[PDB]
Each structure stands twice: as structure tokens, then as C-alpha cells.
Amino acid sequence: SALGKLQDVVNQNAQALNTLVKQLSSNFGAISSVLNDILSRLDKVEAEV
Amino acid sequence: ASVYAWNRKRISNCVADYSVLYNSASFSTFKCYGVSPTKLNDLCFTNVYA
Known part of the structure; x- marks a missing residue:
């Protein structure tokens, strides 16, 4: 759970592309x-x- | 059939040519509502209900 800031930036792009x-x-x-x-x-x- | 009790013949397991039907100029109407009559010969279906 420590690297939340980096994993969040990946997850946001994953949600954005999957929505697109x-x-x-x-x-x-x-x-x-x-x-x-x-x-x-x-x-x-x-x-x- | 009389329209109070319309028939519904199932058409199945065939090759069709809808251009033969469309070229029967004796038909006073041939309106189509989810397909274009020109395209019918390129399509295929699970059933047609007459």
C-alpha cells in the first residue's frame, strides 16, 4: 500500500482508457x-x- | 387469414433471394423498418416469421 501515489496514476489511466x-x-x-x-x-x- | 387471427408461418433452414420478391412490381408496398430491401440478399437470420 505504500506506493499509492504511483499506483493511482496508473489506475486513473486504466479507468480512462477502459471508459474510452x-x-x-x-x-x-x-x-x-x-x-x-x-x-x-x-x-x-x-x-x- | 382474417386479421383478427393472423397466421405466423415460420420460415427456416433455407437459401432465399429477396430480390425476386422486391422485383415483383405488383406489390403496392415494400416498406422496411430495420434493414434496406437492397441489402437483404447479403444478410442471414436465425428465423423469418411470415
């Missing part, structure tokens, strides 16, 4: 989380929205 990665799964109000599924399922005029 997890956010790729968020729909943001689109019909899917995965870009390739939208491009598979939908034609340009709708897929662009």
Missing part, C-alpha cells in the same frame, strides 16, 4: 453499437443518418 473503449459499445441513439452491422443492414441514404 467501453464507449465504442454505446448506441448514442443509433440502431446499433457496431458500425459494420449498420453498413451491412442499411443502404447509404438511411445509413448516413
Whole structure:
């Protein structure tokens, strides 16, 4: 437990990157989380929205 | 079927060609709500319910 200051700086970056990665799964109000599924399922005029 | 008691035939274990359906210009509507009719031939599914 002594090296808390250094381990904290590593842990903050780990939480920040894991949050940034997890956010790729968020729909943001689109019909899917995965870009390739939208491009598979939908034609340009709708897929662009 | 009469709409009070609509049928729901399961379609399964097949190869399909939805362009054959889409090219049947006698169909007065072909609206699609989670896929585009042009893309259907590239897709695959667990089931289709008619």
C-alpha cells in the first residue's frame, strides 16, 4: 500500500482508457453499437443518418 | 387469414433471394423498418416469421 501515489496514476489511466473503449459499445441513439452491422443492414441514404 | 387471427408461418433452414420478391412490381408496398430491401440478399437470420 505504500506506493499509492504511483499506483493511482496508473489506475486513473486504466479507468480512462477502459471508459474510452467501453464507449465504442454505446448506441448514442443509433440502431446499433457496431458500425459494420449498420453498413451491412442499411443502404447509404438511411445509413448516413 | 382474417386479421383478427393472423397466421405466423415460420420460415427456416433455407437459401432465399429477396430480390425476386422486391422485383415483383405488383406489390403496392415494400416498406422496411430495420434493414434496406437492397441489402437483404447479403444478410442471414436465425428465423423469418411470415
